[PDB]
């Protein structure tokens, strides 16, 4: 029982890591994009 | 008589262990899943 | 008797897991939404 | 009993989410308004 | 005699279960309500 | 006897819930007020 | 007993709120005063 | 004899309840007072 | 016997409350003093 | 009997330690990775 | 008879103490190791 | 016993307060010194 | 016989109270010392 | 017997206090060192 | 048993301190390097 329990728990943890990574990638890309747009547009002009 | 009594008692104990293990596996999986979901969703955002 | 008792207990546990999951999903969605709204509105402005 | 308990708890949580959202909307609107007023008035002059 | 005794005992147990369930429902609703109020009011502000 | 005992216990629990709710309302109002005063006075100046 | 206990607890909480409010008023007045002095003296000169 | 025995036992129990209630009221007041003092003094400063 | 026992217990509890209050007063004064020193010295400079 | 019982218990404990270590290694690696990604991407830009 | 009985009982108790000490040493080492790993890895990063 | 225990605890707390105060005084002096050196050297030049 | 028996029992109880008080004083002093050291060293730095 | 038992227990407790103090001293020194290194290196640069 | 347990625990703690120190040294070197590069390149040009 411990075998299956721990294996399923690890698999679920890995999937959750995957979804979390996708979401943080999206969020971080958006925030760095807005910051870079602000900085470049402000300084270059 | 003692032979059959003790053997039946041990078999019943083993089955009860089996059902208990199944139920705790389900419960522990659920609670660890909810805790991991909370932690990952909170920190990653 | 043990069969029916354990089966009913497991079924009730599964239903309780379901309701708990629904409620935590709602709560976590709300809290992450408010936090994301605050962060994006504050930084983007 | 679990049905009614969980349903009432979810409904109360939803209402609390509603009031919290209204209050944070007001607070965030006020703070972004004051910050934008300061920034625009300072730079434009 | 055993019939009536056990039936009455089971009925009394069922009624006691009913009153206990009502009281715990009230208590749990109150405590979760106060905790949720504290959490939402603290974080949203 | 169980009728009266459980009814009185539930009534006492309800009254205690009432006093607890009043006190937490006062405490939470005070703490959110001080926090909001600090935040608004600090940022607006 | 619950009457007197809760009433005394609420009264003590109210007094503590009073002292806390006085102290934060003093502290916030001092910090805003120093910040305003710095800002006005620096910019006006 | 049972009349007097049970009546005296109930009276003694009631008095013991009274002394216990007084002592717990004192103890609970003290502990909540110290906790509230710590919380308010820490946060308000 | 109950009279003397409860009275002595209450007196001992009161003395313990006194020593605890003295110690927490000292500790809280020290910690708030260090925090205020840090804050004022950092901001004023 | 004590020999075999304690030896089996220690072996099972060791295996459980192994699975727990694997899972925490995965979880800690993921969380430190996301935190480091956030920090480096935010500061370097 | 009492001599041999008590001596054997004490010897068995001593051996059981030995096995228990070994097992708790292993368990405590594992749990403190995982906690220290978590703390150091989280803070140092 | 409570007398000596509380007195020794208060004395140890007072000594710890003393060492902590000495160390924070040193640290705060150093950090304010470096900040003031940076500010004065940068602006005066 | 009851005189001597009860007197000896009370004396033995008093001595046991003495040793227990000494040991708890030592243990409590140690644990409060370590906790205070951790708290002061962490916050003051 | 109580004499020797309590004396040995107190001695063992004292030794355990010693080892615990050594270990916490090491751990606290390490953590304060890393925190101070981070703070000084970050601010001074 | 306590001897070996505490000695092994201290040794493991020391090794963990070593790895943590190496990693923070690398991280801090990198972050200070990037900050210094940015500052010098921006100002000198």
Author numbering:
A (entry chain A), B (entry chain A), C (entry chain A), D (entry chain A), E (entry chain A), F (entry chain A), ...: 6 to 50
Quote from the publication:
Inoviruses are filamentous phages infecting numerous prokaryotic phyla. The first inovirus identified, named fd, was reported in 1963 as a DNA-containing phage with an unusual filamentous morphology infecting Escherichia coli. Fd has since become a model for filamentous phage structure, infection, and assembly, as well as having found use in numerous biotechnological applications, including the first described instance of phage display, and as a model for examining colloidal-rod phase transitions. A unique property of inoviral phages, including fd and Pf4, is that they can spontaneously and reversibly self-assemble to form ordered but dynamic structures termed tactoids under crowding conditions.
Using helical reconstruction and applying C5 symmetry, a 3.2 Å-resolution map of the fd phage capsid was obtained, which allowed derivation of an atomic model of the capsid. In agreement with previous predictions, the atomic model reveals a pentameric (C5) subunit arrangement of the pVIII capsid protein, which forms a single α-helix containing 50 residues. The helix is terminated at the N-terminus of the mature protein by a proline residue (P6), and residues 1–5 of the capsid protein, which are located on the phage surface, are disordered. Due to helical symmetry, capsid protein monomers stack almost vertically to form a highly symmetrical arrangement along the helical axis. The C-terminus of the capsid protein, which faces the inner lumen of the cylindrical phage, interacting with the genomic DNA, has four positively charged lysine residues exposed to the lumen. These lysines presumably bind to the negatively-charged DNA phosphates, as also seen in other phages. While density for the DNA is observed in our fd cryo-EM map, it is not well-resolved and does not support atomic model building of the DNA genome. Our structure suggests that while Y21 is involved in hydrophobic interactions within the capsid, it does not act as a structural hinge, evidenced by our high-resolution map. Structural comparison with Pf44, a class II inoviral bacteriophage with a prophage lifestyle, shows a slightly larger capsid size (fd: 50 residues, Pf4: 46 residues) and lumen diameter (fd: 24 Å, Pf4: 22 Å). In agreement with previous work, our structural model for fd suggests a circular single-stranded arrangement, as the higher positive charge-density of the capsid protein (four basic residues in fd versus two in Pf4) suggests that twice as many negative charges of the DNA phosphate backbone are being stabilised.
